[PDB]
Design a protein around this nucleic acid. Sequence first.
RNA 1: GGUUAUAUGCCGCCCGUCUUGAAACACGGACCAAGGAGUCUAACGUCUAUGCGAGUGUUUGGGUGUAAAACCCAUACGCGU
RNA 2: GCGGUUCUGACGUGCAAAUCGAUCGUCGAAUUUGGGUAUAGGGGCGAAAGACUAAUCGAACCAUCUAGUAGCUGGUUCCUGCCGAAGUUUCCCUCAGGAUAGCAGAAGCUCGUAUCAGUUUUAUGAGGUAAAGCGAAUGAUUAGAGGUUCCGGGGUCGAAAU
RNA 3: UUAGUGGGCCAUUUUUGGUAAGCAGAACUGGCGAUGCGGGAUGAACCGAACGUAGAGUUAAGGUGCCGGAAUACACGCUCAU
RNA 4: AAAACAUAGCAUUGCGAUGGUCAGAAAGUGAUGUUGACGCAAUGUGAUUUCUGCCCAGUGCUCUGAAUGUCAAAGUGAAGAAAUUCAACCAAGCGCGGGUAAACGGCGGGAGUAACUAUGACUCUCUUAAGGUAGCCAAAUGCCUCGUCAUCUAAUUAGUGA
RNA 5: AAUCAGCGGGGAAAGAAGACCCUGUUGAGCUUGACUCUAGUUUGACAUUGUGAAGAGACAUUUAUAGUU
RNA 6: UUGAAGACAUUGUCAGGUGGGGAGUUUGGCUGGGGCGGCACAUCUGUUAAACGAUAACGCAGAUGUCCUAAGGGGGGCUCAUGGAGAACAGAAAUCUCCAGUAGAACAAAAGGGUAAAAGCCCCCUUGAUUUUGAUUUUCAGUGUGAAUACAAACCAUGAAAGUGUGGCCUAUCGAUCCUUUAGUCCCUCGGAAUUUGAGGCUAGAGGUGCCAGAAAAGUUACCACAGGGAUAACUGGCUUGUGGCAGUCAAGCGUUCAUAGCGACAUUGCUUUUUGAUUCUUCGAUGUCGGCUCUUCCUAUCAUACCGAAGCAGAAUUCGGUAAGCGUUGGAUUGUUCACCCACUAAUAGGGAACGUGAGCUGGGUUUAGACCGUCGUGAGACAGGUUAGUUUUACCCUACUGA
Lengths: 105, 49, 54
Amino acid sequence: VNVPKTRKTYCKGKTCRKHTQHKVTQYKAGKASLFAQGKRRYDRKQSGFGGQTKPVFHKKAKTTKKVVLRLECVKCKTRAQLTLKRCKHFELGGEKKQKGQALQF
Amino acid sequence: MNPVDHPHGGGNHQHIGKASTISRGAVSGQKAGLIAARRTGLLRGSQKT
Amino acid sequence: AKSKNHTAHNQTRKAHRNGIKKPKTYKYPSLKGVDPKFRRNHKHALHGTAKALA
RNA sequence: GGUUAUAUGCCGCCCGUCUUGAAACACGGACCAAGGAGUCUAACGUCUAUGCGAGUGUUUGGGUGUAAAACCCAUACGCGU
RNA sequence: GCGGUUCUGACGUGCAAAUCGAUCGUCGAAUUUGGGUAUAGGGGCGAAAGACUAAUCGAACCAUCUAGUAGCUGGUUCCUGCCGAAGUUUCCCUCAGGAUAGCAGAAGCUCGUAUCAGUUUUAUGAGGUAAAGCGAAUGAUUAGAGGUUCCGGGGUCGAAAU
RNA sequence: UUAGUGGGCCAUUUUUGGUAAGCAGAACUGGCGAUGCGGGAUGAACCGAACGUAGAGUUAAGGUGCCGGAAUACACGCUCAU
RNA sequence: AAAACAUAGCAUUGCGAUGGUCAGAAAGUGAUGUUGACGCAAUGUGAUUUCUGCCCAGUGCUCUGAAUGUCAAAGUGAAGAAAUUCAACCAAGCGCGGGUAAACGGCGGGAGUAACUAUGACUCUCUUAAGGUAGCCAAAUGCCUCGUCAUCUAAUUAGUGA
RNA sequence: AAUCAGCGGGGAAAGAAGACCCUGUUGAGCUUGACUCUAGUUUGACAUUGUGAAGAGACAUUUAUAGUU
RNA sequence: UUGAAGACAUUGUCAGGUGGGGAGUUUGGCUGGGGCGGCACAUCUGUUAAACGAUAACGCAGAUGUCCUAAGGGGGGCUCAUGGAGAACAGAAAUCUCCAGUAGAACAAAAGGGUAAAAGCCCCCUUGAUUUUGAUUUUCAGUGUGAAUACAAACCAUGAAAGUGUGGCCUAUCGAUCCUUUAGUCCCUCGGAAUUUGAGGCUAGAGGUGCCAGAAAAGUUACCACAGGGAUAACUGGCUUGUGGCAGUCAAGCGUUCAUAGCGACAUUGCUUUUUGAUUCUUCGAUGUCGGCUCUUCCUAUCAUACCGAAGCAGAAUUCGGUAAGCGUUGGAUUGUUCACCCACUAAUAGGGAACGUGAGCUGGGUUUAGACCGUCGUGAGACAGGUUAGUUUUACCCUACUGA
Ligand SMILES: C[C@@H]1C[C@@H]([C@H](O)CC2CC(=O)NC(=O)C2)C(=O)[C@@H](C)C1
Ligand SMILES: [K+]
Ligand SMILES: [K+]
Ligand SMILES: [K+]
Ligand SMILES: [K+]
Ligand SMILES: [K+]
Ligand SMILES: [K+]
Ligand SMILES: [K+]
Ligand SMILES: [K+]
Ligand SMILES: [K+]
Ligand SMILES: [K+]
Ligand SMILES: [K+]
Ligand SMILES: [K+]
Ligand SMILES: [K+]
Ligand SMILES: [K+]
Ligand SMILES: [K+]
Ligand SMILES: [K+]
Ligand SMILES: [K+]
Ligand SMILES: [K+]
Ligand SMILES: [K+]
Ligand SMILES: [K+]
Ligand SMILES: [K+]
Ligand SMILES: [K+]
Ligand SMILES: [K+]
Ligand SMILES: [K+]
Ligand SMILES: [K+]
Ligand SMILES: [K+]
Ligand SMILES: [K+]
Ligand SMILES: [K+]
Ligand SMILES: [K+]
Ligand SMILES: [K+]
Ligand SMILES: [K+]
Ligand SMILES: [K+]
Ligand SMILES: [K+]
Ligand SMILES: [K+]
Ligand SMILES: [Mg+2]
Ligand SMILES: [Mg+2]
Ligand SMILES: [Mg+2]
Ligand SMILES: [Mg+2]
Ligand SMILES: [Mg+2]
Ligand SMILES: [Mg+2]
Ligand SMILES: [Mg+2]
Ligand SMILES: [Mg+2]
Ligand SMILES: [Mg+2]
Ligand SMILES: [Mg+2]
Ligand SMILES: [Mg+2]
Ligand SMILES: [Mg+2]
Ligand SMILES: [Mg+2]
Ligand SMILES: [Mg+2]
Ligand SMILES: [Mg+2]
Ligand SMILES: [Mg+2]
Ligand SMILES: [Mg+2]
Ligand SMILES: [Mg+2]
Ligand SMILES: [Mg+2]
Ligand SMILES: [Mg+2]
Ligand SMILES: [Mg+2]
Ligand SMILES: [Mg+2]
Ligand SMILES: [Mg+2]
Ligand SMILES: [Mg+2]
Ligand SMILES: [Mg+2]
Ligand SMILES: [Mg+2]
Ligand SMILES: [Mg+2]
Ligand SMILES: [Mg+2]
Ligand SMILES: [Mg+2]
Ligand SMILES: [Mg+2]
Ligand SMILES: [Mg+2]
Ligand SMILES: [Mg+2]
Ligand SMILES: [Mg+2]
Ligand SMILES: [Mg+2]
Ligand SMILES: [Mg+2]
Ligand SMILES: [Mg+2]
Ligand SMILES: [Mg+2]
Ligand SMILES: [Mg+2]
Ligand SMILES: [Mg+2]
Ligand SMILES: [Mg+2]
Ligand SMILES: [Mg+2]
Ligand SMILES: [Mg+2]
Ligand SMILES: [Mg+2]
Ligand SMILES: [Mg+2]
Ligand SMILES: [Mg+2]
Ligand SMILES: [Mg+2]
Ligand SMILES: [Mg+2]
Ligand SMILES: [Mg+2]
Ligand SMILES: [Mg+2]
Ligand SMILES: [Mg+2]
Ligand SMILES: [Mg+2]
Ligand SMILES: [Mg+2]
Ligand SMILES: [Mg+2]
Ligand SMILES: [Mg+2]
Ligand SMILES: [Mg+2]
Ligand SMILES: [Mg+2]
Ligand SMILES: [Mg+2]
Ligand SMILES: [Mg+2]
Ligand SMILES: [Mg+2]
Ligand SMILES: [Mg+2]
Ligand SMILES: [Mg+2]
Ligand SMILES: [Mg+2]
Ligand SMILES: [Mg+2]
Ligand SMILES: [Mg+2]
Ligand SMILES: [Mg+2]
Ligand SMILES: [Mg+2]
Ligand SMILES: [Mg+2]
Ligand SMILES: [Mg+2]
Ligand SMILES: [Mg+2]
Ligand SMILES: [Mg+2]
Ligand SMILES: [Mg+2]
Ligand SMILES: [Mg+2]
Ligand SMILES: [Mg+2]
Ligand SMILES: [Mg+2]
Ligand SMILES: [Mg+2]
Ligand SMILES: [Zn+2]
């Protein structure tokens, strides 16, 4: 799937509340902090004897992730997120489809 | 012997079943066979330096 | 071992013991799912009729 | 007329159990006595009775006593408002 | 003396929780054996059978934790009266089990001939099963008949010929 | 508000798999399970009919040679099987 | 009670004591050891005779082998008010590379080709390391199978030889 | 009626809550390239821990800088 | 005291590696037993399905874990499959033209439905595939998830406009709690008081659980254990009779000639329970599990013997058939065998049943516990309806039956 690098869509920002132009990127998770309370608790639980104290997932099934778009408004800089359906190939501002061309050998 | 008694024990034929060469870093109960062997098999030649 | 999978045998007999009750009707049903634009006005209309029979 | 034993006519498989289905060629039971299995507690739901009622609950404790009883009680605290 | 092959003998509620008879292996050593002594339970000891470790061994015995847990088996003690089921729904490492809804009892409460009803009638909808159809669409299928190839092919003239 | 239950099974009709099955699986109803009683010799489910204790009458389904309560009844035919 | 175990014989492995193998909760602690390679420890095979093929890709074991892959804690540097963050450095091990089958083990398939046909010494091929050598065989190892031939018998799923 | 010696057809005779098989969210003996650990062992760091040298390398193609490993 | 050794080593603490030697644990489910296989486990289309809805089976034929900035949204113009007749090279098939053409095309992907100045084809403009939360339909407990429907309040797109548009013409295309992470408010909290970092909250997403309402998980046991199961396999028995076995009917042919002496194709009706399946009703607090030996009795579908009919019956030998189960039906080699096979005798060497008769009647060769060897398989423990060798066969004195007393 191919989606354009810009998109005019609604902006929730209090100085907009109207359709504005947005830059479109893909969302990437973010580095897990060592001081997030869950990480600190896990570290305490894992210390000492007793081995692995929490489940470890093994039974992977999916071969895709949902794509999320980060839309940044070009006026106010407010951001929004949009989830696409599952897909195997994703590109952002790819070359558009030409109709009615000879498929080369 | 039976498995309870020796690493080599057991089996529906008598056989070792894993390499008989054992690491120098193996622990008591594992060091049976040829410990830390540089080579094995019939020595074709003279052993003198 | 294998067992029975499904049947509705005996289910209508069970249903008819405490009968199949028709759902019971009121003057004044809920205005629930009625168009909000209509409802919003209708409040204002009913307000005025009170302030008039007074 | 009752009771009881017997006779006669007709009828009447061995109980208990699990089970769709037991008289079963399913299981327990030779016999008899005595023992032998839904209890108490903490905290709760519905319902009912009783007291008092925007309150209610004396019993931690104190007072008293014919002494583990009965009788009396301040401040809190609990639940409710 | 030590052993324990065969009879698959006796016996098999025994003489005996391993015996008896005959037959048999070995009989100067890797021999047999008394006493002393060492090795102790995930331990010992093993010319190795998971053998032996006090009639206990693929982990002894004793006490305790311990009335260990059991979706599994068995049992569960007086009388009469009235009402009276389910084996189905959904979810569950669910399929010999639960939760859930249903069916059932009890307690009633608000009223008092309604609102009702495993029923008919009248009116008015919906339905694509039974039947039917295939000289109607799709698909299958028997037979001739007529017609046509600016072309399919066998027969034979035919320069070649729509 | 709370119990039990959450193995079902059979018959008629509709019905799938299967050569078929007292086989496996569905549909609607009635049953058995939970239920005795009269009948079908016998039998969970068929037919009749559902049950307080008694008396009398009448019947259901099934019967009336004898066993066995009830016509070796009446009537028209058919049938003789080493 | 045996064809199993042991056995002599054979072969391999480790170790020169600051040691190998093994013990202990620990120890100014132990076994081997009153020992010292013709020894102690760990394995395999199983008298003599005769022989003991090929494969180091895998798993293992092993190496004064390359290094700049991976790479802990402490330490170091930078940023920051600091908690901290980031980086560089970075032991052994892993990875990379060599050795080793009396280490665990492995030892396939197709096509063509000789002057009767047949067969294929010979040749070409595919294949994950290599492609079963010497021998031996319907063997206590062969499904098909009571294999085929011979012998043994009147007759043999038996026996023996092939 | 009451019975004696025999006998092994039957009592699906007796002996043991089937060892086979399945089920149980019941085990245990054993194995491994299962999950999770662990004695031991090995490697580094700090401590035990004091006192001296000398070279050879690294840090802001050769070759000079000052400090620090 | 004397040698060695020396700030190394040793010892202590922490860190990385190694570590079935050892410890603990796990090693789904459904299922015509279980296992192997499959997925009927989350789903979608058509049919089964009995014309409302619901509806099973490891029923039938198929599909899903995607794909798309257009293949989404709006508007415009146009018309498809196919066939016919024409046009240099050009032919069955190239491109152009006319006529016919109810969809026989296309619409991402299964199948069904839907669609013609369109929902198809081409072109133009776009981001309604957006924001805020509620209601509703399906599945249903009337929970969740998914999917979908109609509005509201905004902001937009398109179009002259009415309108249409909250992703894909409709019916599938997917995911809790905890944790992490992002967006939003730049808001609440850090509880002696402040500021700034950090952490924690509130609202909306993503990271995934396919066993799809969502454990973190490998084997073996013939050394085996326990709770149970006839809810479930391995005998008999029962239902069934495909398969096996036996018998009919028809008569095209065969039989020198001649359908039927004897046979008999294509068809087709049955019987039997001496085959083997199918099933799972009985038995898992146990009905002793192959074969032989012994012994009795029964069936007849008759091998022999008696008496007969028929013949392609001259005789002799034989063949087909009837009444017949009265009477017999064997000795051996090999194999545990059942079965088979051969030698031989014979009047004849028929077939079967009785819990696949018969183990408190035997035996124990086979099978089928524990020992052991081999081969193949397996890294291994171990497996083998493969071969091989060794492996405790218990009790009657009761009742009946029977034999005698
Ligand atoms: C696989 C990863 C983790 C997983 C999840 O946090 C696992 C948890 C779930 C839970 O409630 N308790 C636990 O202890 C484990 C999740 O959400 C995924 C998207 C991302
Ligand atoms: K072994
Ligand atoms: K089941
Ligand atoms: K079922
Ligand atoms: K009397
Ligand atoms: K029972
Ligand atoms: K029994
Ligand atoms: K141990
Ligand atoms: K003892
Ligand atoms: K123990
Ligand atoms: K259960
Ligand atoms: K019609
Ligand atoms: K038609
Ligand atoms: K209930
Ligand atoms: K329930
Ligand atoms: K009844
Ligand atoms: K009856
Ligand atoms: K009646
Ligand atoms: K009689
Ligand atoms: K060896
Ligand atoms: K190799
Ligand atoms: K190697
Ligand atoms: K054990
Ligand atoms: K030191
Ligand atoms: K360690
Ligand atoms: K280990
Ligand atoms: K099966
Ligand atoms: K829903
Ligand atoms: K599940
Ligand atoms: K296990
Ligand atoms: K048949
Ligand atoms: K059975
Ligand atoms: K049984
Ligand atoms: K004879
Ligand atoms: K023996
Ligand atoms: Mg800590
Ligand atoms: Mg730790
Ligand atoms: Mg072991
Ligand atoms: Mg063995
Ligand atoms: Mg090993
Ligand atoms: Mg059920
Ligand atoms: Mg099902
Ligand atoms: Mg009298
Ligand atoms: Mg009677
Ligand atoms: Mg039963
Ligand atoms: Mg009973
Ligand atoms: Mg019976
Ligand atoms: Mg029982
Ligand atoms: Mg008894
Ligand atoms: Mg008793
Ligand atoms: Mg008593
Ligand atoms: Mg003796
Ligand atoms: Mg004996
Ligand atoms: Mg005796
Ligand atoms: Mg053994
Ligand atoms: Mg108890
Ligand atoms: Mg107990
Ligand atoms: Mg009643
Ligand atoms: Mg679950
Ligand atoms: Mg039960
Ligand atoms: Mg139709
Ligand atoms: Mg239909
Ligand atoms: Mg029809
Ligand atoms: Mg309950
Ligand atoms: Mg259930
Ligand atoms: Mg149940
Ligand atoms: Mg059944
Ligand atoms: Mg019942
Ligand atoms: Mg009758
Ligand atoms: Mg009479
Ligand atoms: Mg012996
Ligand atoms: Mg030996
Ligand atoms: Mg030798
Ligand atoms: Mg570090
Ligand atoms: Mg290194
Ligand atoms: Mg092997
Ligand atoms: Mg050869
Ligand atoms: Mg051979
Ligand atoms: Mg052989
Ligand atoms: Mg031979
Ligand atoms: Mg012989
Ligand atoms: Mg032979
Ligand atoms: Mg008897
Ligand atoms: Mg006797
Ligand atoms: Mg049992
Ligand atoms: Mg077993
Ligand atoms: Mg379960
Ligand atoms: Mg265990
Ligand atoms: Mg283990
Ligand atoms: Mg299962
Ligand atoms: Mg479901
Ligand atoms: Mg319908
Ligand atoms: Mg479209
Ligand atoms: Mg709902
Ligand atoms: Mg869905
Ligand atoms: Mg504070
Ligand atoms: Mg689920
Ligand atoms: Mg059964
Ligand atoms: Mg019994
Ligand atoms: Mg018995
Ligand atoms: Mg018996
Ligand atoms: Mg006859
Ligand atoms: Mg039979
Ligand atoms: Mg028998
Ligand atoms: Mg016996
Ligand atoms: Mg027998
Ligand atoms: Mg017997
Ligand atoms: Mg035997
Ligand atoms: Mg054995
Ligand atoms: Mg006597
Ligand atoms: Zn903005």
